RNA sequence: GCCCGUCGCUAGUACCGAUUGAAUGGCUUAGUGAGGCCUCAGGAUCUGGGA
RNA sequence: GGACUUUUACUUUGAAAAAAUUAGAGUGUUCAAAGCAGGCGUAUUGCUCGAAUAUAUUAGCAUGGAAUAAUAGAAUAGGACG
RNA sequence: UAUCUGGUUGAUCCUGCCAGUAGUCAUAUGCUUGUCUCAAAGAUUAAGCCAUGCAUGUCUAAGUAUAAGCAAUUUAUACAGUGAAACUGCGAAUGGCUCAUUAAAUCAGUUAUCGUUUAUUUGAUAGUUCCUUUACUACAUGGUAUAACUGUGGUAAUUCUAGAGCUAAUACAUGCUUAAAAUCUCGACCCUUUGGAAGAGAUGUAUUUAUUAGAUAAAAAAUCAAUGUCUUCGGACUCUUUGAUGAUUCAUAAUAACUUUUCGAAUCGCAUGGCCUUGUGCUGGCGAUGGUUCAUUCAAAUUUCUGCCCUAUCAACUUUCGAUGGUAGGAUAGUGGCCUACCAUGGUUUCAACGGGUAACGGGGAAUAAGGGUUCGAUUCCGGAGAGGGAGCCUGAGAAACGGCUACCA
């Protein structure tokens, strides 16, 4: 309908943000960026709706424009900048670092990380092509382009990215039995090693997954994000470790911790 | 369809960028290109052995099979190089908790690599639009003749 | 302007269809270049998304390659003699892809006799070396060698003059040349 | 273009308009818990109706089916919470019983009277509204 | 009041479709064209005003015209225009040839000059140097990273050759 | 006792009906055809063949 | 990796899947329709639970079943294996 | 949350409808009306018509300041603060509103691009630009023509503008530059071998064409033409380099050329330091704006499978002037009868085509509570369409735009 759409009616806004139905009408429409609209957490949301550091949206621009906030290393000043999964958000003042990884409910959690871990990030490589002049490149889920990767890096492998400098320093192949983080679907936020891949030529590979509770599920290969070895992630996980408790199990945990 | 002639158009029929150098004396006159369409569809031998041209041929032409896979049952072979199949299908109606017979005709391209007749069951594979109505291209014959030669004269 | 929608047009059933929405520019069409021969005239058309397309109307030289010889020269286009689509393109000498044209020969003759030292139809040092190194390899082809005597060579336009602004092509050869030769006289 | 405000109505009117047995039965309640409306009874019968519908449904599911266990237990402790469901009878075939009067005898207007403090439900009403 | 328009010919008035960069129309909006009445270029008794331009001077002076003279509002601003308006050669340094306009502040007289442009200055030359530098500095950096990869490829081949001679 | 139809009064509805009756809306033949676009020209003026 | 595969219906489990609505959990908006809040302290420089679940049916995808109901098979053998 | 009752008879049991009863995010109207919270609302009829006002404008240290503007102090005799106006850039293609059209259309779920365009955001990305290549090309940086303005004017009348005189750039228009290397072609010469050579040109990216590489289905041999590297000069060639997809003529590269030749920074702001042969030399900090190609993101455009209300007092329909297919072209961002040539005779239908109706936008949904159903959805979210009716088009990444233009009709 004539051109690019610029608004977003709250209600059409993605749910994992947790915005209230009333109080306004629109939700902030995520800028074009390194993460898709529907799977992103705009800076406005993070600074005010999660960290509670700002009350106004107008106060969020106030915070940002002093370059207090900086994403994956760079300063960044875009109220609705599309922060996304694996990104690293930093506040120099307040000496605070953050990673965007998922809940178990499929929400972006406030997860505090050490200055040391704020060094780097993890990127799923999403395609590996031959660039102009024969220079091979990889391209990761957050749309970084990295020239001259290791030949043994293929698609779906995950990659340790420097940040300070753009380079790669490692890569975990997509083998049977490797720590996986689920990034979409219902099983969003669950974690579980990998059992086996259903091939399916020309239409969606299924990836059978089992966690550290001997529980099993299945997602499309698209939704699967390797992050290390069973036992050994390559980043700190949120509390929960992505195990998914039954509504009963959750009930009891909450009503077992009852006495003030 | 094709049959005979092959060089029977106003334009000279050729496979693009498949050059045969006249300087180099060859023993097969014309260099021929083909692929396999994938999804484990055998490129039949008439496609390679052949000399027909068809740039809408799944195996010797510039189409690709991607998308859907449909198996219909062929109900008309009157159009040169294209067929119409009847897709055989069956359809539920909740209020009455029974079904009702339905059908849909589909037009599909058919390479001279295949030799289809009315009655054959035919597996078709989706491709880019190829004509006003055709979005499908034969790809494999599950049939044969449907007991034709088993109907000759008396004893 | 010219719409390329399908939504005019009867449905495969034979049914008539109602108008739903007006013409959109993104289904638009433009008019034919109908490019002719001689004295360079080329206009740009502004296409979708920024982007130029070059409408050659009138052209006198194109870049033409002698496939089997692995070289390509720029020549005058003498022009048109056979067209598979429409014979008025020929009579009007109109330039389009697939047009059979005659080109010039002289640039290909100069090359060949410089490269082979053999001359078509009818004393340097290393040059002698190279020529003698070639041949058993200079054996041309009957129906091409004969074209040079007339100073005019058959060629199939292979570019799209109305889109690219270039009128480029290859020299006819082998069976393909045989083919248009046969038409060229089985109609003359 | 703003989120709709959701509402619900909270009562239900009896089909037969003039059934004197039901009409007596309703009035007695009105004068026994100091109500002002047939609606204040119509309301509770509606609250009940769904609680019962809920319970009915769960009962049709298997003994110790996950949903049954989760939402059934939850429904019970909610009911126990306010004092409609007695402690002993605590497993939903009794909520399946229950009764309008059980819900009534837990209103603040009645509890204010039940232990002294008012002596007559009507004094008890007047006291409540008057802050 | 309708204006004349060079080129139309005609001694009447006509309505024309005008564009950007044409007389008798100032477009309000990019790509806007308006249809507008226009008077022809040929003179006739219908004209309220003829616009003449003395090309050369008669035998006598015309009062408020040849006997009064009014100076150009603005002086040369761009570096070389200052050069040509005084004929100077790139040696003389413009800075002092730039014109200066006086203005009184009651009991203060101020002097304000333009701001020369395309004037060659230290700051510019520094930015020329710098870009020249980056192009080369990158170029060499870009060569290294290739060679180092060629290494990674070379001694990978040297793993698949001490492997393919192990078993 | 019941009860059928023509005939007569009031009121209502629909039907047939000269008027080759009327009206609105959607498509459309043939004829005429604005305008922008594309194109063969043109060349007030104004440059270095071009605008 | 090569070489080939009689067709279907039905059923199962799962994936992919907007929110709001709906069913429904948690939480005393004073109640309630709602809302998605809120709750604890050192109430002087903070601690903390949430923001579930279900449904989502026809068609398409993916996995298990082999009853029921169809299809096809070797009889002028142009049958089957090697 | 599985209920019925009144009325045909003298009375009776039925069939059967009328009436009662109950709800309605269901509208109107009548009467009556105190408090809290909540809060729909010119859809239905007339996508009928509209007085006036408002609803789209916009500036950072960082494109353009000689306001004959304001301000003065504070280092500023080029400029330097602040800033009207104007140029330039960007935006006005979002939003908001309505439901007229629309019945295989749209829409939903599910697909496809190996079928394309894509401002912007994000990440990558450029040593090649000149020239018969010693008396040399502005790089210490090349060209004017214009607004605002001054001043002369025209009309009853508008966001009308004319003649004259100025002056800017990240507007317009031009136009230099940088290492080493390797490979190709030519070849002055010398010498006959088995044969080699000084030095001459060409090789950025993009555009167009033609050509070749892009292997791999397990292993080996001979010969013909050209021609590689190493000679223990009969001869050997040993190790020989390979990306992605289910699938490609894919990504990428190589050869011969082609082009009214695309891009390859003449831009701006803060800082002013190092280095010695003391040239105002040579270096050099942070980050703005820009820029080609690729990727990403926001998109778009088409597209697969299945699903629509009433209707036979609609049975055959489709090619007038494309209906269904084949070939070639043209056009398009691109597939395609999209359009044009040639050729053929196809395409749909009782499993309801084709035609008609709809007081028809689709969907999420709403009402009604045993279950199965029935009715509704102009309308808070998604999709589509429109801006009195039609068509045409300029700008632009994006519009067939209407708070844009153009014509016709009202
Ligand atoms: Mg935004
Ligand atoms: Mg796919
Ligand atoms: Mg035919
Ligand atoms: Mg034309
Ligand atoms: Mg400047
Ligand atoms: Mg299911
Ligand atoms: Mg939900
Ligand atoms: Mg009676
Ligand atoms: Mg009676
Ligand atoms: Mg009697
Ligand atoms: Mg009734
Ligand atoms: Mg309304
Ligand atoms: Mg209206
Ligand atoms: Mg000033
Ligand atoms: Mg809108
Ligand atoms: Mg000029
Ligand atoms: Mg520019
Ligand atoms: Mg080989
Ligand atoms: Mg390979
Ligand atoms: Mg290619
Ligand atoms: Mg200094
Ligand atoms: Mg009728
Ligand atoms: Mg009949
Ligand atoms: Mg065709
Ligand atoms: Mg004709
Ligand atoms: Mg016919
Ligand atoms: Mg019917
Ligand atoms: Mg309607
Ligand atoms: Mg609706
Ligand atoms: Mg409806
Ligand atoms: Mg309506
Ligand atoms: Mg519109
Ligand atoms: Mg109106
Ligand atoms: Mg019309
Ligand atoms: Mg319009
Ligand atoms: Mg508008």
PDB file of N, CA and C (backbone and C1' of nucleotides) in Angstrom, chain A residues 11-12 15 18 20-22 38 50 105 107 185-186 198 200 206 218-220 223 247 254, chain G residues 1 14-21 35-37 40-41 49-53 61-63:
ATOM      1  N   UNK A  11      -0.633  -3.834  20.090  1.00  0.00           N
ATOM      2  CA  UNK A  11      -1.622  -4.898  19.854  1.00  0.00           C
ATOM      3  C   UNK A  11      -1.082  -5.711  18.701  1.00  0.00           C
ATOM      4  N   UNK A  12      -0.510  -5.028  17.707  1.00  0.00           N
ATOM      5  CA  UNK A  12       0.129  -5.719  16.592  1.00  0.00           C
ATOM      6  C   UNK A  12       1.589  -5.949  16.931  1.00  0.00           C
ATOM      7  N   UNK A  15       4.389  -9.993  21.174  1.00  0.00           N
ATOM      8  CA  UNK A  15       3.916 -10.152  22.548  1.00  0.00           C
ATOM      9  C   UNK A  15       5.028 -10.261  23.568  1.00  0.00           C
ATOM     10  N   UNK A  18       5.827  -7.639  26.221  1.00  0.00           N
ATOM     11  CA  UNK A  18       4.990  -7.434  27.400  1.00  0.00           C
ATOM     12  C   UNK A  18       4.577  -5.974  27.586  1.00  0.00           C
ATOM     13  N   UNK A  20       1.481  -3.167  27.898  1.00  0.00           N
ATOM     14  CA  UNK A  20       0.113  -3.146  28.397  1.00  0.00           C
ATOM     15  C   UNK A  20      -0.853  -2.733  27.305  1.00  0.00           C
ATOM     16  N   UNK A  21      -1.999  -3.406  27.238  1.00  0.00           N
ATOM     17  CA  UNK A  21      -3.028  -3.101  26.239  1.00  0.00           C
ATOM     18  C   UNK A  21      -3.389  -1.628  26.162  1.00  0.00           C
ATOM     19  N   UNK A  22      -3.602  -0.998  27.307  1.00  0.00           N
ATOM     20  CA  UNK A  22      -4.028   0.396  27.332  1.00  0.00           C
ATOM     21  C   UNK A  22      -2.811   1.313  27.473  1.00  0.00           C
ATOM     22  N   UNK A  38      10.001  -8.584  14.130  1.00  0.00           N
ATOM     23  CA  UNK A  38       9.275  -9.462  15.026  1.00  0.00           C
ATOM     24  C   UNK A  38      10.125 -10.247  16.047  1.00  0.00           C
ATOM     25  N   UNK A  50      11.980  -2.712  30.792  1.00  0.00           N
ATOM     26  CA  UNK A  50      12.672  -3.763  31.549  1.00  0.00           C
ATOM     27  C   UNK A  50      13.513  -3.188  32.685  1.00  0.00           C
ATOM     28  N   UNK A 105       9.958 -18.699  28.613  1.00  0.00           N
ATOM     29  CA  UNK A 105       8.615 -18.359  28.210  1.00  0.00           C
ATOM     30  C   UNK A 105       8.685 -17.701  26.841  1.00  0.00           C
ATOM     31  N   UNK A 107      10.653 -14.953  26.247  1.00  0.00           N
ATOM     32  CA  UNK A 107      10.777 -13.519  26.407  1.00  0.00           C
ATOM     33  C   UNK A 107      12.240 -13.144  26.567  1.00  0.00           C
ATOM     34  N   UNK A 185       9.426 -20.325  17.615  1.00  0.00           N
ATOM     35  CA  UNK A 185       8.448 -21.391  17.750  1.00  0.00           C
ATOM     36  C   UNK A 185       7.832 -21.433  19.130  1.00  0.00           C
ATOM     37  N   UNK A 186       7.261 -22.560  19.518  1.00  0.00           N
ATOM     38  CA  UNK A 186       6.800 -22.611  20.882  1.00  0.00           C
ATOM     39  C   UNK A 186       7.996 -22.930  21.745  1.00  0.00           C
ATOM     40  N   UNK A 198      16.393 -34.689  11.083  1.00  0.00           N
ATOM     41  CA  UNK A 198      15.580 -35.188   9.967  1.00  0.00           C
ATOM     42  C   UNK A 198      15.883 -34.400   8.714  1.00  0.00           C
ATOM     43  N   UNK A 200      15.032 -34.184   4.978  1.00  0.00           N
ATOM     44  CA  UNK A 200      13.934 -33.547   4.213  1.00  0.00           C
ATOM     45  C   UNK A 200      14.350 -32.580   3.097  1.00  0.00           C
ATOM     46  N   UNK A 206      14.000 -31.023  10.335  1.00  0.00           N
ATOM     47  CA  UNK A 206      13.578 -31.059  11.724  1.00  0.00           C
ATOM     48  C   UNK A 206      14.753 -31.431  12.613  1.00  0.00           C
ATOM     49  N   UNK A 218      10.998 -30.987  19.319  1.00  0.00           N
ATOM     50  CA  UNK A 218      11.368 -30.892  17.902  1.00  0.00           C
ATOM     51  C   UNK A 218      11.116 -29.494  17.371  1.00  0.00           C
ATOM     52  N   UNK A 219      12.064 -28.945  16.618  1.00  0.00           N
ATOM     53  CA  UNK A 219      11.841 -27.679  15.913  1.00  0.00           C
ATOM     54  C   UNK A 219      12.398 -27.708  14.506  1.00  0.00           C
ATOM     55  N   UNK A 220      12.011 -26.723  13.705  1.00  0.00           N
ATOM     56  CA  UNK A 220      12.616 -26.552  12.398  1.00  0.00           C
ATOM     57  C   UNK A 220      14.063 -26.106  12.584  1.00  0.00           C
ATOM     58  N   UNK A 223      15.173 -22.787  13.475  1.00  0.00           N
ATOM     59  CA  UNK A 223      14.977 -22.265  14.820  1.00  0.00           C
ATOM     60  C   UNK A 223      16.017 -22.710  15.834  1.00  0.00           C
ATOM     61  N   UNK A 247       3.109 -26.525  34.279  1.00  0.00           N
ATOM     62  CA  UNK A 247       2.356 -25.532  35.048  1.00  0.00           C
ATOM     63  C   UNK A 247       2.187 -25.952  36.511  1.00  0.00           C
ATOM     64  N   UNK A 254       6.656 -22.063  43.298  1.00  0.00           N
ATOM     65  CA  UNK A 254       6.240 -20.735  43.742  1.00  0.00           C
ATOM     66  C   UNK A 254       5.527 -20.793  45.087  1.00  0.00           C
TER      67      UNK A 254
ATOM     68  P     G G   1      25.193 -37.498  -0.691  1.00  0.00           P
ATOM     69  O5'   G G   1      25.548 -38.578  -1.819  1.00  0.00           O
ATOM     70  C5'   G G   1      26.756 -38.479  -2.565  1.00  0.00           C
ATOM     71  C4'   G G   1      27.127 -39.762  -3.277  1.00  0.00           C
ATOM     72  C3'   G G   1      26.043 -40.473  -4.069  1.00  0.00           C
ATOM     73  O3'   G G   1      25.658 -39.862  -5.286  1.00  0.00           O
ATOM     74  C1'   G G   1      27.189 -42.062  -2.821  1.00  0.00           C
ATOM     75  P     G G  14       1.270 -33.956  20.755  1.00  0.00           P
ATOM     76  O5'   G G  14       2.320 -33.281  19.747  1.00  0.00           O
ATOM     77  C5'   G G  14       3.707 -33.518  19.894  1.00  0.00           C
ATOM     78  C4'   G G  14       4.501 -33.139  18.668  1.00  0.00           C
ATOM     79  C3'   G G  14       4.411 -31.709  18.188  1.00  0.00           C
ATOM     80  O3'   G G  14       5.124 -30.816  19.012  1.00  0.00           O
ATOM     81  C1'   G G  14       4.413 -33.164  16.338  1.00  0.00           C
ATOM     82  P     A G  15       4.787 -29.252  18.976  1.00  0.00           P
ATOM     83  O5'   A G  15       5.463 -28.740  17.620  1.00  0.00           O
ATOM     84  C5'   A G  15       6.872 -28.832  17.419  1.00  0.00           C
ATOM     85  C4'   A G  15       7.251 -28.745  15.957  1.00  0.00           C
ATOM     86  C3'   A G  15       7.066 -27.386  15.299  1.00  0.00           C
ATOM     87  O3'   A G  15       8.175 -26.548  15.506  1.00  0.00           O
ATOM     88  C1'   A G  15       6.152 -29.069  13.915  1.00  0.00           C
ATOM     89  P     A G  16       7.952 -25.026  15.920  1.00  0.00           P
ATOM     90  O5'   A G  16       7.234 -24.401  14.656  1.00  0.00           O
ATOM     91  C5'   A G  16       7.984 -24.075  13.502  1.00  0.00           C
ATOM     92  C4'   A G  16       7.070 -23.651  12.388  1.00  0.00           C
ATOM     93  C3'   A G  16       6.245 -22.404  12.662  1.00  0.00           C
ATOM     94  O3'   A G  16       6.963 -21.209  12.397  1.00  0.00           O
ATOM     95  C1'   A G  16       4.847 -24.112  11.810  1.00  0.00           C
ATOM     96  P     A G  17       7.330 -20.179  13.579  1.00  0.00           P
ATOM     97  O5'   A G  17       6.320 -20.559  14.754  1.00  0.00           O
ATOM     98  C5'   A G  17       5.258 -19.684  15.096  1.00  0.00           C
ATOM     99  C4'   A G  17       4.185 -19.667  14.035  1.00  0.00           C
ATOM    100  C3'   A G  17       3.039 -18.706  14.292  1.00  0.00           C
ATOM    101  O3'   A G  17       3.363 -17.408  13.814  1.00  0.00           O
ATOM    102  C1'   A G  17       2.202 -20.843  13.613  1.00  0.00           C
ATOM    103  P     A G  18       2.722 -16.080  14.471  1.00  0.00           P
ATOM    104  O5'   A G  18       1.130 -16.325  14.342  1.00  0.00           O
ATOM    105  C5'   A G  18       0.226 -16.055  15.414  1.00  0.00           C
ATOM    106  C4'   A G  18       0.454 -14.674  15.968  1.00  0.00           C
ATOM    107  C3'   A G  18      -0.246 -14.317  17.263  1.00  0.00           C
ATOM    108  O3'   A G  18       0.439 -14.918  18.369  1.00  0.00           O
ATOM    109  C1'   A G  18      -0.348 -12.512  15.720  1.00  0.00           C
ATOM    110  P     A G  19       0.494 -14.328  19.877  1.00  0.00           P
ATOM    111  O5'   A G  19      -0.803 -13.422  20.015  1.00  0.00           O
ATOM    112  C5'   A G  19      -1.031 -12.706  21.205  1.00  0.00           C
ATOM    113  C4'   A G  19      -1.172 -11.242  20.929  1.00  0.00           C
ATOM    114  C3'   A G  19      -2.421 -10.618  21.490  1.00  0.00           C
ATOM    115  O3'   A G  19      -2.317 -10.399  22.877  1.00  0.00           O
ATOM    116  C1'   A G  19      -2.138  -9.903  19.268  1.00  0.00           C
ATOM    117  P     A G  20      -3.284 -11.199  23.879  1.00  0.00           P
ATOM    118  O5'   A G  20      -4.613 -10.335  23.857  1.00  0.00           O
ATOM    119  C5'   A G  20      -4.519  -8.918  23.887  1.00  0.00           C
ATOM    120  C4'   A G  20      -5.713  -8.250  23.257  1.00  0.00           C
ATOM    121  C3'   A G  20      -7.061  -8.839  23.589  1.00  0.00           C
ATOM    122  O3'   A G  20      -7.482  -8.535  24.901  1.00  0.00           O
ATOM    123  C1'   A G  20      -6.985  -8.391  21.298  1.00  0.00           C
ATOM    124  P     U G  21      -8.632  -9.409  25.591  1.00  0.00           P
ATOM    125  O5'   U G  21      -9.858  -9.148  24.610  1.00  0.00           O
ATOM    126  C5'   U G  21     -11.136  -9.646  24.912  1.00  0.00           C
ATOM    127  C4'   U G  21     -11.809 -10.313  23.734  1.00  0.00           C
ATOM    128  C3'   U G  21     -12.395 -11.664  24.031  1.00  0.00           C
ATOM    129  O3'   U G  21     -13.480 -11.619  24.917  1.00  0.00           O
ATOM    130  C1'   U G  21     -11.423 -11.735  21.920  1.00  0.00           C
ATOM    131  P     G G  35      -8.907  -5.805  30.655  1.00  0.00           P
ATOM    132  O5'   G G  35      -7.779  -5.121  31.535  1.00  0.00           O
ATOM    133  C5'   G G  35      -7.617  -3.714  31.519  1.00  0.00           C
ATOM    134  C4'   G G  35      -6.696  -3.261  32.615  1.00  0.00           C
ATOM    135  C3'   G G  35      -5.336  -3.937  32.665  1.00  0.00           C
ATOM    136  O3'   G G  35      -4.428  -3.397  31.725  1.00  0.00           O
ATOM    137  C1'   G G  35      -6.261  -3.867  34.832  1.00  0.00           C
ATOM    138  P     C G  36      -3.472  -4.354  30.869  1.00  0.00           P
ATOM    139  O5'   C G  36      -2.394  -4.855  31.915  1.00  0.00           O
ATOM    140  C5'   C G  36      -1.702  -3.944  32.754  1.00  0.00           C
ATOM    141  C4'   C G  36      -0.979  -4.679  33.844  1.00  0.00           C
ATOM    142  C3'   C G  36       0.120  -5.616  33.349  1.00  0.00           C
ATOM    143  O3'   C G  36       1.153  -5.667  34.325  1.00  0.00           O
ATOM    144  C1'   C G  36      -1.483  -6.852  34.531  1.00  0.00           C
ATOM    145  P     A G  37       2.331  -4.580  34.313  1.00  0.00           P
ATOM    146  O5'   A G  37       2.561  -4.241  35.856  1.00  0.00           O
ATOM    147  C5'   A G  37       1.840  -3.213  36.526  1.00  0.00           C
ATOM    148  C4'   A G  37       0.645  -3.746  37.287  1.00  0.00           C
ATOM    149  C3'   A G  37       0.704  -3.670  38.805  1.00  0.00           C
ATOM    150  O3'   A G  37       0.391  -2.385  39.309  1.00  0.00           O
ATOM    151  C1'   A G  37      -0.194  -5.764  38.119  1.00  0.00           C
ATOM    152  P     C G  40       3.305  -7.307  51.244  1.00  0.00           P
ATOM    153  O5'   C G  40       4.472  -8.204  51.851  1.00  0.00           O
ATOM    154  C5'   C G  40       5.505  -7.619  52.622  1.00  0.00           C
ATOM    155  C4'   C G  40       6.846  -8.258  52.367  1.00  0.00           C
ATOM    156  C3'   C G  40       7.995  -7.603  53.109  1.00  0.00           C
ATOM    157  O3'   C G  40       8.088  -8.032  54.443  1.00  0.00           O
ATOM    158  C1'   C G  40       8.585  -7.796  50.856  1.00  0.00           C
ATOM    159  P     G G  41       7.445  -7.118  55.587  1.00  0.00           P
ATOM    160  O5'   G G  41       8.725  -6.572  56.378  1.00  0.00           O
ATOM    161  C5'   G G  41       9.361  -5.375  55.958  1.00  0.00           C
ATOM    162  C4'   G G  41      10.828  -5.557  55.669  1.00  0.00           C
ATOM    163  C3'   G G  41      11.730  -4.499  56.279  1.00  0.00           C
ATOM    164  O3'   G G  41      11.992  -4.701  57.645  1.00  0.00           O
ATOM    165  C1'   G G  41      12.326  -4.783  54.026  1.00  0.00           C
ATOM    166  P     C G  49      12.740 -12.808  41.412  1.00  0.00           P
ATOM    167  O5'   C G  49      11.272 -13.451  41.499  1.00  0.00           O
ATOM    168  C5'   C G  49      10.960 -14.548  42.354  1.00  0.00           C
ATOM    169  C4'   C G  49       9.480 -14.860  42.329  1.00  0.00           C
ATOM    170  C3'   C G  49       8.843 -14.863  40.944  1.00  0.00           C
ATOM    171  O3'   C G  49       8.976 -16.091  40.279  1.00  0.00           O
ATOM    172  C1'   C G  49       7.543 -13.533  42.391  1.00  0.00           C
ATOM    173  P     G G  50       9.336 -16.101  38.725  1.00  0.00           P
ATOM    174  O5'   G G  50       8.469 -14.920  38.101  1.00  0.00           O
ATOM    175  C5'   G G  50       7.580 -15.175  37.022  1.00  0.00           C
ATOM    176  C4'   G G  50       6.202 -14.611  37.280  1.00  0.00           C
ATOM    177  C3'   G G  50       5.394 -14.220  36.053  1.00  0.00           C
ATOM    178  O3'   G G  50       4.692 -15.322  35.511  1.00  0.00           O
ATOM    179  C1'   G G  50       5.310 -12.485  37.677  1.00  0.00           C
ATOM    180  P     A G  51       5.020 -15.833  34.027  1.00  0.00           P
ATOM    181  O5'   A G  51       4.324 -14.743  33.098  1.00  0.00           O
ATOM    182  C5'   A G  51       2.933 -14.481  33.215  1.00  0.00           C
ATOM    183  C4'   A G  51       2.596 -13.072  32.808  1.00  0.00           C
ATOM    184  C3'   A G  51       3.122 -12.624  31.461  1.00  0.00           C
ATOM    185  O3'   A G  51       2.319 -13.082  30.387  1.00  0.00           O
ATOM    186  C1'   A G  51       3.509 -10.934  33.069  1.00  0.00           C
ATOM    187  P     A G  52       2.816 -14.247  29.390  1.00  0.00           P
ATOM    188  O5'   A G  52       2.879 -15.536  30.314  1.00  0.00           O
ATOM    189  C5'   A G  52       2.130 -16.696  29.994  1.00  0.00           C
ATOM    190  C4'   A G  52       2.440 -17.813  30.957  1.00  0.00           C
ATOM    191  C3'   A G  52       2.110 -19.215  30.480  1.00  0.00           C
ATOM    192  O3'   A G  52       3.117 -19.740  29.632  1.00  0.00           O
ATOM    193  C1'   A G  52       1.314 -18.921  32.688  1.00  0.00           C
ATOM    194  P     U G  53       2.723 -20.746  28.455  1.00  0.00           P
ATOM    195  O5'   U G  53       1.492 -21.542  29.050  1.00  0.00           O
ATOM    196  C5'   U G  53       1.619 -22.902  29.394  1.00  0.00           C
ATOM    197  C4'   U G  53       0.291 -23.468  29.792  1.00  0.00           C
ATOM    198  C3'   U G  53      -0.650 -23.799  28.652  1.00  0.00           C
ATOM    199  O3'   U G  53      -0.335 -25.019  28.009  1.00  0.00           O
ATOM    200  C1'   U G  53      -1.826 -22.588  30.286  1.00  0.00           C
ATOM    201  P     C G  61       1.379 -32.337   2.095  1.00  0.00           P
ATOM    202  O5'   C G  61       2.457 -31.854   3.170  1.00  0.00           O
ATOM    203  C5'   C G  61       3.604 -31.134   2.740  1.00  0.00           C
ATOM    204  C4'   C G  61       4.450 -30.628   3.880  1.00  0.00           C
ATOM    205  C3'   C G  61       5.067 -31.689   4.776  1.00  0.00           C
ATOM    206  O3'   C G  61       6.248 -32.234   4.218  1.00  0.00           O
ATOM    207  C1'   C G  61       4.097 -29.995   6.110  1.00  0.00           C
ATOM    208  P     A G  62       6.405 -33.818   4.027  1.00  0.00           P
ATOM    209  O5'   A G  62       6.727 -34.330   5.506  1.00  0.00           O
ATOM    210  C5'   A G  62       7.809 -33.772   6.230  1.00  0.00           C
ATOM    211  C4'   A G  62       7.786 -34.128   7.692  1.00  0.00           C
ATOM    212  C3'   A G  62       7.417 -35.554   8.079  1.00  0.00           C
ATOM    213  O3'   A G  62       8.459 -36.496   7.863  1.00  0.00           O
ATOM    214  C1'   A G  62       6.337 -34.038   9.519  1.00  0.00           C
ATOM    215  P     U G  63       8.135 -38.027   7.504  1.00  0.00           P
ATOM    216  O5'   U G  63       7.744 -38.666   8.897  1.00  0.00           O
ATOM    217  C5'   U G  63       8.721 -38.759   9.916  1.00  0.00           C
ATOM    218  C4'   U G  63       8.138 -39.266  11.204  1.00  0.00           C
ATOM    219  C3'   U G  63       7.365 -40.573  11.129  1.00  0.00           C
ATOM    220  O3'   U G  63       8.179 -41.726  11.063  1.00  0.00           O
ATOM    221  C1'   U G  63       6.128 -39.021  12.374  1.00  0.00           C
TER     222        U G  63
END
